[PDB]
Amino acid sequence: MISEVKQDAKSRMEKSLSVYLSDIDGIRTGRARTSVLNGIVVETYGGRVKLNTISSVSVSDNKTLMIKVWDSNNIGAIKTAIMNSNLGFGISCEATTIRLTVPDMTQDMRKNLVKLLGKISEDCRVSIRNIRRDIMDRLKVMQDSKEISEDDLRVAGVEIQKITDDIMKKVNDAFTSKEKELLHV
Amino acid sequence: MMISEVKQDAKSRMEKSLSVYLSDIDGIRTGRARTSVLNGIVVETYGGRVKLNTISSVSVSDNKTLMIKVWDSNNIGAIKTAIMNSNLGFGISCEATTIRLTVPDMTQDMRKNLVKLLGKISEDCRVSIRNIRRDIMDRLKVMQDSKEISEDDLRVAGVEIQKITDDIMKKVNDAFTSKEKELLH
Ligand SMILES: [Cl-]
Ligand SMILES: [Cl-]
Ligand SMILES: [Cl-]
Ligand SMILES: [Cl-]
């Protein structure tokens, strides 16, 4: 069934783009962003919880986040979890608010991240092209196995080459957007 | 952001590539009778949907022939429909409570093509695995340049992830040569 093969393309491609966005989303840029704390796991209330379910995070200025802790008994555990992530924030507190200052990014650190983000952008393109090559290889198998005609191969090839190109534009826009965050002040 | 999580990402993503390639080559006809070809067959009967192997028992009769013992002979039509709809290319005949499937004969030119395509599909899998390793290594390098982990930390993680890659590469290659042996008899 070609119908089942055309969905493996979009599924594998979307899943791959989804993996690469999550990977770059955490790359630090100098500017303070609440998502850097997305995935801080705090041990409280008998288990492990995401930081945003027991507090409220906000950007105070370019280099600072505020964390409003609703249960004051969670302040130490949150301070401990943030410190032990080794993200290296400046940590202090007043009453039920934790203040995080974002460490400065040096010039060399910023150039290394520009290069490493380019490499990851190409690792993404490679998986998208490799998915495409593999899907065509599968259709060539079906067409050689006399399961589909040649017309079925060219037609689905055009449709999938169109799906690949649209998915790739998302890849280039996402990695260009992240690069602009690195480059600007 | 923890090295342990990055390592688990490598494993999970390379096991997804391995699993996807195994299913790709499972769709390659070999000219020989193999019961695994009918594993996914879903049969509409008794007003619902059942796996083929809960209403029947598939055996290999000779090199080019499968025998399906249909316990409820009233299911023979529904099973024949299910198999023919999956477009697997079988010759089919009925007899009492039995369905004879003849494997479609494979020319030497088809076999030559499928060997070549198996090698391409296999190398696509290797490209995916190596790309994942490079991507994971780039993510570790981002963490090191961002001062979240040391250079020794990264090298230690790099060896462990080389171990994961070697182990999944070996399973890709063993599936490759085993599938080649089947294509060549
Ligand atoms: Cl600081
Ligand atoms: Cl650096
Ligand atoms: Cl894949
Ligand atoms: Cl590197």
From Swiss-Prot, chain B:
SUPFAM superfamilies assigned: Ribosome recycling factor, RRF
InterPro entries reported in the protein's UniProt record: Ribosome_recyc_fac (IPR002661), Ribosome_recyc_fac_dom (IPR023584), RRF_sf (IPR036191)
Gene Ontology cellular component terms for the protein in this record: cytoplasm
Keyword Protein biosynthesis in record: yes
Gene Ontology biological process terms in this record: translational termination
Name of one Pfam family that matches: RRF
Cellular location(s): Cytoplasm
GO molecular function ontology, one term from the record: ribosomal large subunit binding
Keywords: Cytoplasm, Protein biosynthesis
PANTHER family: MITOCHONDRIAL RIBOSOME RECYCLING FACTOR PSEUDO 1 (PTHR20982:SF3), RIBOSOME RECYCLING FACTOR (PTHR20982)
Reported function: Responsible for the release of ribosomes from messenger RNA at the termination of protein biosynthesis. May increase the efficiency of translation by recycling ribosomes from one round of translation to another.
Family: Belongs to the RRF family.
Protein name from the UniProt record: Ribosome-recycling factor
Source organism (scientific name): Ehrlichia chaffeensis (strain ATCC CRL-10679 / Arkansas)
Gene: frr
